[PDB]
Structures are given as structure tokens and as C-alpha cells.
Amino acid sequence: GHMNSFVGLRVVAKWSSNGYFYSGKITRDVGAGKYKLLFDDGYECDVLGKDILLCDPIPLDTEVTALSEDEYFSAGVVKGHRKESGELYYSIEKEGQRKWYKRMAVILSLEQGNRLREQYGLG
């Protein structure tokens, strides 16, 4: 395949207002270890390298938060994967049944994302 150093890569990043980890594209290395992230929700914010996870397609059995487009929030566990229209999806099992959600909707609660930071963290 092909890649570029940070800028352009889809990654998961912490929303710096002490929030969870959400999907985004690194728009630019800001400097000093900050990289700006065009979140897939269209927000654009600097995030420090330690707060970005760049090789993070969610592993199955990981616990995650899930957001419906009609803005309902829950948490559950990844139990599968899909690809549709060039976008990456996860079947989040909740209440013993699978529900499909998309990368930007499968948000890693901060204590979940921490377990990935030690491996996938840029910093």
C-alpha cells in the first residue's frame, strides 16, 4: 500500500475538552506534538500526539460507546465489522443483540481509549 506521516490519516483522537476519543483525519501537524484533527463530525481542533490513536480499528470484544444519528447514546461491545460505501462499520452488541454503528459513532470512552493509547498513541 501507501501512507504519509500523520497528515491525511484517519485516526481516533481525544476531544480536548476532557472528552472521549472520536474518529478524525489529521489535517496538519500543528507543531510541538499537536496535530489538528478534522473529526468526521466536521469539528476541527488541535489534539496532542499522546491523545491520538492511529492504528485503531476497534478490536472486537472492546467496550465502546455508540451514538445513533438521532443522537441517542449507549455503551456496548464490538462483536463484528462491515464495510459499506467506503466507510468502516462495527456491529456493537448491546442487550444481547447486534446494532450496526459507523466509526465516528463508535466512540471510545476515555478509559477504553487509554488501553489503546499505550500501543497506538502517536506520542
Partner: peptide, 14 residues
Amino acid sequence: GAKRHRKVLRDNIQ
């Protein structure tokens, strides 16, 4: 019951 609890999503961004 429950509803979006943190900042996520937006509209007209395309």
C-alpha cells in the same frame, strides 16, 4: 431514558 451525552456529530459540513 437517555440522549447524546457529549459533543459528537454536526450537519451541513459537506
